Amino acid sequence: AASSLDELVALCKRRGFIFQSSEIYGGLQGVYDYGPLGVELKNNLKQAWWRRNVYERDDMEGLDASVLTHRLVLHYSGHEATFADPMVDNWTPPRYFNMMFQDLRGPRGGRGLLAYLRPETAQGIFVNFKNVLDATSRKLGFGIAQIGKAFRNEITPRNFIFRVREFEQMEIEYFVRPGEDEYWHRYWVEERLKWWQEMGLSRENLVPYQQPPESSAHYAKATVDILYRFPHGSLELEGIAQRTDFDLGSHTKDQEALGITARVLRNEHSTQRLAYRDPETGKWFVPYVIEPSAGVDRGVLALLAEAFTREELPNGEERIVLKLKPQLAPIKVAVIPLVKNRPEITEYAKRLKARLLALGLGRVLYEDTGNIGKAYRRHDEVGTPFAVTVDYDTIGQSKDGTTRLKDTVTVRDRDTMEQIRLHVDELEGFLRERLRW
Amino acid sequence: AASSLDELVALCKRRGFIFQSSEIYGGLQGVYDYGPLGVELKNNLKQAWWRRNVYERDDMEGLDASVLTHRLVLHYSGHEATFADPMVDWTPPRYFNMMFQDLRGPRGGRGLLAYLRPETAQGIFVNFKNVLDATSRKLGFGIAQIGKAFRNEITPRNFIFRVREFEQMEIEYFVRPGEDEYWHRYWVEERLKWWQEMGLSRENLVPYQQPPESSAHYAKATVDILYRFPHGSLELEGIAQRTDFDLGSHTKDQEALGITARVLRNEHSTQRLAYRDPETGKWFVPYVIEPSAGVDRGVLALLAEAFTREELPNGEERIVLKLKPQLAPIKVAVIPLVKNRPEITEYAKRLKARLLALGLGRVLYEDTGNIGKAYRRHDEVGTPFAVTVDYDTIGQSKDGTTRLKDTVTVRDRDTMEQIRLHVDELEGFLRERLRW
């Protein structure tokens, strides 16, 4: 585990995980960019999440909605009226600053040409309920998963990835029948909690907090936050709320014909009825929604934070090692040529990297950087699990003349630091064993 | 292949590929949303692209920059100026600027203005030094990236084509001033070749080499790959050659580095975006080759191409999306013959999981009524195989034999041929046909 927030910010910048967006012109404070190593880890996390909640389940439909949100969507969801914070200057009278990113479509800044950069992914889901329903012919006890970008017009962007203006989320909207709501809520909480550990976070660092009714927003019958023990303090990773029929409620047509339980605004615009019908009979009703929502960047940081570890070495000095779960490492194997000038060597290495990539266990990388020592260092810092290295013996140029050593390479374990030399054909099975899911 | 643009728009909406963003409130014309089936295909394409240009190569670094762009980036890249033009049509004296913009935090002050990037490339350019430092890369190398971009279109025409929000797959290949012309043709063959591997016919592809009149000033050459869509040729990808303009326009110590393209005096940049050590110690700004594709366009191209209407032996027709298997939103559909039977449904579900485990792509358990409707629904969304489970599969054959236990019928999308095989063979059957 890592001890300081800056150790991370430093590594992140130093090894190419994260960079201050627009750095060369002073930065656009509050927005960051993901480097070579960052994109990989980030994507690996998003994928593992998608595989788990969509592919592996049989009640989940996927989605990808746009960032440009029509003014109305955000009126009827309440944001226009409440997504704000209390602000002032130096002392003027106090007033709420609505934190949404607004931008005007086309020609003129007229009130009717205003649109928003969605501040959360969920509304995209809600407005498409009927749509999704029609096209898939889904029955109840079902949700819609989605990953995407969101923009919060924060006032003061604090410590790193935490208080940012642009970021990404992984949200699910699980539609449920009014009666069964309380069950599904605890079901999802165990599930998400469980997932995070499988990804590599320790139970000791996870904290399932249940919000007291003072904190619960009006339509939220209950909600639990999963916090992670970061170096600088506990920060929220994911939130599993229970929103009754508020969301579907606020956007649907024929509001008073469908017995809506949460208080909604009169909707004089919606063209479709977002409700479900046929509880064996013919009743229309608005489903209740359970909603797990995680923040991609937070997750990426949690993983780094957890993995980060400093080890003392027998000679006296230390080393930084990202102990990331293998399947999630930005790089799985690094193939390194002992000498940089030799062509039969580089050409072999490259031929080998490809053979390994073909196993389909994750990114294999051909490394041509000078100094076999620097390489090992660079890799432990970015958490890659294995390093295979190629030398003259591997080729067949043994100074003694035998070829008993042709096609064998040394593979160095990231964690144990143990190096063993094995023949290539065994190397495959070795890797399957250790890298498969 | 498909004959009309509306046939597609219709299928896309009908089967859950694409929907009009904000439809229930009148739509936010010009922006669309990707449904269950759409997200899948879209992602499948992005991935195949990433695997190819990053994993399979040894000179590529990946990236993911933010949409919120600082005002300055877009000043020095030229964009800001292309639209600082009072056009008086008498209608009022406007600025017909093509970028969405917005202001950061507290006030609408000029120093607090920001933009929603209109292209992904600038994110790459500004980080050149950064990426360089952290990776210790040598020349003959690029940076790949996928992301969102926003064009403040005035009139959103025909579907996916003239839209305000969309995504791109761009690469910035940094090259030494001398070798530029070579790399340019290299990339063109490569991209061209890729597109066909994805399933597009050579007959429908059109490599247009822009004549000196079209080329923006700093562009020493450029080729557009057009696709023959039902409504006409529309641009899929563009491989330009931008010399040292981009890196040039953003770097510090401009006149110390012999920049060849005309750039603006840059009084703000804090880093020097150049390369040094041509064996010696000379500094210079690399030339850039740039393949840039539009995700949505690609998705449409694939759909357009795959779309086909067939006349069947009984007399009726059918719509079949002939998508390349590895790209299909769904690889296998496991379907139960009767919906009420527990031994059947329970069997089928257990089977779908066994198949998903093969790691060949999404397998889906289908519980929709009517075995006929299912087959139809699937050919329409282009899923390659359909396995079906019945009473024989379980072991309740009305003839009394058990020779047919643990076997299922699998219907080929294309040939429509159905063969009944045992489950264990089924695996090998699928690997054969579905692997990359």
What's the SSE blueprint?
The structure holds 2 chains of a larger assembly.
Chain A: H1 5-15, E1 18-20, E2 32-34, H2 36-55, E3 60-63, E4 68-70, H3 73-76, H4 79-82, E5 84-87, E6 95-98, E7 101-104, E8 114-117, H5 122-126, H6 129-136, E9 142-151, E10 166-176, H7 181-198, E11 206-210, E12 222-230, E13 233-242, H8 246-251, E14 276-277, E15 284-285, E16 288-295, H9 296-307, E17 308-312, E18 318-322, E19 333-337, H10 343-357, E20 364-366, H11 372-381, E21 386-390, H12 392-395, E22 408-413, E23 419-423, H13 424-435
Structure commentary:
The structure holds 2 chains of a larger assembly. By secondary structure, chain A is α+β, with helices and mostly antiparallel strands. In chain A, 43% of the residues are buried. The first copy, chain A, has 13 helices and 23 strands. The first copy, chain A, has two domains: 1-306, 2-Layer Sandwich (BirA Bifunctional Protein, domain 2), CATH 3.30.930; 325-437, Anticodon-binding domain (Rossmann fold, 3-Layer(aba) Sandwich). Chain A has a seven-stranded mixed β-sheet with strand order 3-9-10-16-13-12-11. A five-stranded mixed β-sheet of chain A has the order 20-19-21-22-23, sandwiched between helices. The interface between A and B is large, with 80 and 77 residues. It is classed as protein biosynthesis. The entry lists the keywords protein biosynthesis, ligase, synthetase, aminoacyl-TRNA synthetase.
* Structural class label of chain A: alpha+beta
How many domains, in number, for the residues of chain A? Answer: 2
Query: Which sheet architecture does the biggest sheet of chain A show?
Result: 7 strands, mixed
Radius of gyration of chain A: 26 Å
In whole angstroms, how far apart are the ends of chain A? 23 Å
CATH class of the largest domain in chain A: Alpha Beta
CATH architecture of the largest domain in chain A: 2-Layer Sandwich
Largest interface, chains and sizes: A-B, 80 and 77 residues
Q: What is the general shape of chain A?
A: elongated
Subunit structure (chain A): Homodimer.
Main location (chain A): cytoplasm
Catalytic activity (chain A): tRNA(Gly) + glycine + ATP = glycyl-tRNA(Gly) + AMP + diphosphate
Binding site for substrate (chain A): 120, 167-171, 291-295
